[PDB]
Design a protein around this nucleic acid. Structure first.
Lengths: 209, 38, 176, 142
RNA sequence: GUGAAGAGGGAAACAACCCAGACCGCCAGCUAAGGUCCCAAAGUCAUGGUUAAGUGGGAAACGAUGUGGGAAGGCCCAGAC
RNA sequence: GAUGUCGGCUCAUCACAUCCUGGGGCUGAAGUAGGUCCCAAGGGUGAUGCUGUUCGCCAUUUAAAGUGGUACGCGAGCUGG
RNA sequence: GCUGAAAGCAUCUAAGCACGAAACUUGCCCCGAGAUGAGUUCUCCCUGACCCUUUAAGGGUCCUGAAGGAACGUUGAAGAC
């Protein structure tokens, strides 16, 4: 079933009457406007393309402006597609807002995790460090061996090594929906979601449930 | 089931059958007479 | 081969359709049909059918015998059908038919419900008997086997679903 | 005098459409390969592609003898150490029916850039509808 | 006997195995061992059989109503299995 | 005219003759728990006292604490008992 | 296991039809059209003259310079560059 695009506002807590503190992520879900509808006849698959937010009129290019003008919607900060289930049907220019999640109870949140930059093996793959003392010679956080010997004679593909960590697409599944707040355009989910404050999140009803 | 290189009729109620390229002995009187060759 | 030598007698009220390989039988019990092997002659004659091999088909006699047996079972199918009887042995074991579904209480923590296929009907005279009726011999045998598989007769008291005409052959543990 | 050599800029190639339903896989792939390479032309030259374009229809109806429909296995390795993957002939026909014909013919074609250029002229389809009516392919019986 | 101190062709590759001993040139022909569906030159050759495991294309004692050929015995229309 | 050795550490990867979990046949299988064989390599598969030890013996765990190959895997990665 | 002959019977198998495991293919997550087999969809931009010969997917001059991009600057929960 289709999802929505919001932004990570931050984290807080919700106190319940029986004395439980729920950590929540606050997701601001403004209305998403349908910009294009794909169908089997023309595109080969069924999907809707949406936009949300706002963009500076002098910062939106002529091709994007023309694409928005065909749908008759104001420019947003991006475009996202959601695949369409069999029963679902939408029309170009229609607004979809946060009460879509009114009775969902579990969501799948996708965002871009924070970038850690170039990371060593100890941090990136939880490699164990070698001895801090007892003779160790300049080899305290180094990876150790990386292969066997003549018989393979190479390093195997997929070897765990140091490199870029984070700053990639991550999904967290089956988060409790704590509060759907229609007139505030707020979605409150329980737990942490990928990304930094102010980043874009895609929220979808949980597929595993 | 006995899995053996040499399967044989252990009594008179035992029957040698070939099921999908496997010589098997199915007895109708004693369950511990079941054999497959392999 | 030789089983195939004996023709199958068509009684009155049952008629035969032959389309080369696919043959259909009609009767008071319903529609039975199958496609025979590519290596068997079937020929309707005076109230009988006869079976024989083609040419250039090795082991056409074995297929002829198989086809003869299947057709003979079809004939007894559309007339008076076939019946299978099951017995439930063991304390608390019970059965009941609700239309197309048999409900079995076989000592599990969950109910057991079996969905009968198209041409099979069931009825329980008592709560520990099951009687199946149908035209297809293979299908009724398959249904009886499926019912038996839920709780196979165990060899120490004979408890479980079993065919009415079945010998269980229990045993003792060590002594006493 | 020197023997004739085909000139790549003056070779004339025709379009043929073959129907694969019921044909034995290898015995069809052999004829396909020899006509893709050009060995049927008297102008055959080993270093220039003088073959024809072939359209193959009904790739999922190709036939194998014996027990190969469930016993012929297609191996390939992904490049990772886990690596080795396999699919039977039935599984390949169910997933990508075109590739059984494609890899049979590719195995029967010469190796190197010319062999790949030759393979480029084979067009395999699962149905019996192709998109190359503008090329006016002639019917070929194999 | 060959290699060593011998190239060429075959055995996928493969001193020492099979065929065969390179004076030089030829965009001529016949053969050897090995081959003749495609990679890859030449039989999708002809006739008669066998095999159904991809046997062919790795492995023994031993095991089995897997089939094809002999060769001879029983039991049987007074009725055999 | 040099292919660094046992053990530890770090990092592994494959085989299956399977230690655990999964499926099944037989049992001298009532149940619980076992014995034995067949299928199965997806994942998992201890911390210590002693000793340079691998191993082993002990002490406590664990669903289990598998067997092997990889220059007795790994010193242009560490140690150097 | 069902039905079932070869082999009047038996037989899960030869024809035919059911079940059946963490293994296999999917289902879940991520990369992914340099998939040279380089795919698809939507939107935006540019519709002026002349000259030469070697004649053609030819060159050269004048006018023109779009949509976009880059560069520079202020920077970032992006980053070795």
């Amino acid at each position: 079933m289709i999802g929505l695009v919001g932004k990570k506002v931050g984290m807080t807590r919700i106190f319940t009457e029986d004395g439980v503190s729920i950590p929540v992520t606050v997701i601001e879900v403004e209305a998403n406007r349908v910009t294009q509808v794909k169908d089997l006849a023309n595109d080969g698959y069924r999907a809707i393309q949406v936009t949300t937010g706002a963009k500076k009129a002098n910062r939106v290019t002529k091709p994007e402006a023309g694409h928005f003008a065909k749908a008759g919607v104001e420019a947003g900060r991006g475009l996202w597609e959601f695949r369409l289930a069999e029963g679902e049907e939408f029309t170009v220019g229609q607004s979809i807002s946060v009460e879509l999640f009114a009775d969902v109870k579990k969501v799948d949140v996708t965002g871009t995790s924070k970038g850690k930059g170039f990371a060593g093996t100890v941090k990136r793959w939880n490699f164990r460090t070698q001895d801090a003392t007892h003779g160790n010679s300049l080899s305290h956080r180094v990876p150790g061996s990386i292969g066997q010997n003549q018989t393979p004679g190479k390093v195997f593909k997929g070897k765990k090594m140091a490199g870029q960590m984070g700053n990639e697409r991550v999904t967290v599944q089956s988060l409790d929906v704590v509060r759907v707040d229609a007139e505030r355009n707020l979605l409150l989910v329980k737990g942490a979601v990928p990304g930094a404050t102010g980043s874009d999140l895609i929220v979808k009803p949980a597929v595993k449930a | 089931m006995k899995v053996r290189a040499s399967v044989k009729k252990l009594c008179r109620n035992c029957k040698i059958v070939k099921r999908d390229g496997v010589i098997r002995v199915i007895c109708s009187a004693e369950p511990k007479h079941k054999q497959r060759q392999g | 081969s030789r089983v195939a030598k004996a023709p199958v007698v068509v009684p009155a009220g049952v008629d035969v359709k032959i389309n080369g390989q696919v043959i259909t039988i009609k009767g008071k019990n319903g529609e039975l049909t199958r496609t025979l092997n590519d290596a068997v002659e079937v020929k309707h004659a005076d109230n009988t059918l006869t079976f024989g091999p083609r040419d250039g088909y090795a082991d056409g006699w074995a297929q002829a015998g198989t086809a003869r047996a299947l057709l003979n079972s079809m004939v007894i199918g559309v007339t008076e059908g076939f019946t299978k009887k099951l017995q439930l042995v063991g304390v608390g074991y019970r059965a009941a038919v609700k239309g197309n579904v048999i409900n079995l209480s076989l000592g599990f923590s969950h109910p057991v419900d079996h969905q009968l296929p198209a041409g099979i009907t069931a009825e329980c005279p008592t709560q520990t008997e099951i009687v199946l009726k149908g035209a297809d011999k293979q299908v009724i045998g398959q249904v009886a086997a499926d019912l038996r598989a839920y709780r196979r007769p165990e060899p120490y008291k004979g408890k479980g679903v079993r065919y009415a005409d079945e010998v269980v052959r229990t045993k003792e543990a060590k002594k006493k | 005098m020197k023997t004739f050599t085909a000139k790549p800029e003056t070779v004339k190639r025709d379009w043929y459409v073959v129907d694969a339903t019921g044909k034995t896989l290898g015995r069809l792939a052999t004829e396909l390969a020899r006509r893709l390479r050009g060995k049927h032309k008297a102008e055959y030259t080993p270093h220039v592609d003088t073959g024809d374009y072939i359209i193959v229809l009904n790739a999922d109806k190709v036939a194998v003898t014996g027990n190969k429909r469930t016993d012929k296995v297609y191996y390939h390795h992904t490049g990772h150490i886990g690596g080795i993957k396999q699919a039977t002939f039935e599984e390949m026909i169910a997933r990508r029916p075109e590739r059984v014909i494609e890899i049979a013919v590719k195995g029967m074609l010469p190796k190197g850039p010319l062999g790949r250029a030759m393979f480029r002229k084979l067009k395999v389809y699962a149905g019996n509808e192709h998109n190359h009516a503008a090329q006016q392919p002639q019917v070929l019986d194999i």
